[PDB]
Amino acid sequence: AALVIDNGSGMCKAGFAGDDAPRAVFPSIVGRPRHQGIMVGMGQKDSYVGDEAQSKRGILTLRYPIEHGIVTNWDDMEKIWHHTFYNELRVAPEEHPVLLTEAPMNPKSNREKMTQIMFETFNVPAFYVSIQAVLSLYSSGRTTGIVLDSGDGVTHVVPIYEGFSLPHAILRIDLAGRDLTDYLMKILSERGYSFSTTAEREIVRDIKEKLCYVALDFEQEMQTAAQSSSIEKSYELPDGQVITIGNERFRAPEALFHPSVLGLESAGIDQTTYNSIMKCDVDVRKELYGNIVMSGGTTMFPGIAERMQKEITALAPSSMKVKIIAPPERKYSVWIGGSILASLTTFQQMWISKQEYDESGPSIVHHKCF
Template identity: 65%
Template sequence: MADGEDIQPLVCDNGTGMVKAGFAGDDAPRAVFPSIVGRPRHTGVMVGMGQKDAYVGDEAQSKRGILTLKYPIEHGIVSNWDDMEKIWHHTFYNELRVAPEEHPVLLTEAPLNPKANREKMTQIMFETFNAPAMYVAIQAVLSLYASGRTTGIVLDSAEREIVRDIKEKLAYVALDYEQELETAKSSSSVEKSYELPDGQVITIGAERFRCPEVLFQPSLIGMEAPGIHETTYNSIMKCDVDIRKDLYGNIVLSGGTTISKGEYDESGPSIVHRKCF
């Protein structure tokens, strides 16, 4: 085992759609892969190919045609501990190629993660992976720190696999939703093609901006809930009057669904300001 000064803590951010892992002090994660575990749909379908009981991350995604894929994390909360343990094992031994018993571990959790889940995370780290020390931090707080702030409000919105890919390639937030809707009705200028994993090609039109708009207008899909701008405002109004000004000036968007074009690009500030205020 190396000297204490040479031992870097491991950081593992377990998101609903993606796992980000690396070493404390690095500028970026060493490993980023889907938070999925796949198992063969039929026994013996991969004879002669070294079939395994389970596949994790990119390998599971590449074999999706013959696997049943599952997400062990739902809305930021671990729902399948056996699969979650497989993801952690893959993270430590295959992605980072380290012995977890030689490194302190920092894990992340959702703000409303039940205490029992935190205890289970701790149990697995100590009893299964023999970590010498571990800490569980709230993802939103870490997002705030990563943006160089210690005071602020974080809007965290997660993602999933195929929808994530479509969203990153095609989706955008409309500067003027009603005007964009009229444009989509009168012409095909907003239409784009997307090839699904099975080879089927679909055409996506107004959905490119209608889907992100649901974040601001949940009523578009029949949900009686406030939009993210109202949720952010309501959250700030529940805080002490003294810190509201700081919160308004430090709103951080976090999570895969907040990276739609038009939120953080050159048009982003005006769009977010228009939607929120």
Template identity: 60%
Template structure:
């Protein structure tokens, strides 16, 4: 949660350390420097069971505009388990679900143009990849790699009506999100999608930074405060 008091004291004041690849171009460094200082944007977050989109304005979340969708990583795993049966691969137990989840995280990707990618997969084996199961057996998957995360953009593929609001960690998600949002936004609006490689741990990283700030200490809930006000103290300290 984000503390309510002294917003200006902790938004943008924390020290940050960023990773980069060897020989990272100067242009990439400059773009990263620009992004670090921004305090307005939209956070798209997709976990295991739920997805959220959270608008941020000048460091503040806008609760009235937050959207939630019960479609996330677990549903993608279920979808992959289902479409793998088309190749004759059956995964049904809890342990086998974990195998499929690992397969999804290692091999799935988001197609920039789904229909075109589908046609390519029918005429070429370029999208096929091998995956070694724990028992040493090797299986091959192809179009399933991008059909799985496509449900984020076409929930109707698994019987859902609503459109997705948040991305997972699949490769290609930034380009696809940029394409989809650009098509919806006014032509005068510049769209920039940022998908840092460490986004799987963004919640932990952000919480760690926030909790380490000296200005955040006043936002802790002490036992004395809890004894005096009860559970409702959380509403005055956090939002």
């Protein structure tokens, strides 16, 4: 048996290898109370974590300890993994090897410290790290294809061909679900709803996750939303006030396709996907315009696959096939991929041993892990 952990930028996911879904899924938040606890005997916790910090969030400040795939507060990341093992999953980490997951292009000391914690704090017997996107080929059941991952923290494009990683053609893009949440909060001020707080940041996250959709023609839908209320769905806040959302319902996720809206130098996930395909080779692109795998929760918007089709077919060569492979499992495809990978018998020889970590410190990972 082995444990698979998405270590998600947004939702953490964890479970046993060989399962079809993670068992623990919870937001990767640590909540700190921001007020004096006047009532004796409530035993107020000094730091809530996961969905506890959701339920109490009104009295809390919520912080993600992982920003853009970089762990920004390790002591909180420790609290999150501790909660995962003991409270949320109820498993002994000393008994089971752990497959962690990381974004690509990720600062090397992050992968180092990650294993320093996982061995010296949790005493995991054997361990591995793998790239979020790469696992999506396993959950797709494939050996070729270009993966759009788009977590809360990072969008990264990873072309793979015949199990070779084409590492020079990875594009990493900082548009991600968290930044779409923030941009929605920025434009949702246009109707005069104020949501500046982190407790309200979470509400804007729910509004995005439920009511938003990707425009299939941004200018036409801007025109029709200026002409008609047809699009103007309405949401009910945790205080029971109703709000109505105009063209913001799609102007927000359109940021994925014109990042100049966020002022970013980058380019849309469409154009950067195309550009990664252009970058990889002439030989393989025949097999990468088809078989565009797509992954992670930000790729969950309605209409996103259709927009990707339209854009890539507008960028790819004339009479080149395009196929945006978008399962319904996108939100878990990374974890499912890790579950498959850890299941494979032909992988059980690859785990980094605790004994090897005793032979050499965390730097061992840069030798053993790819």
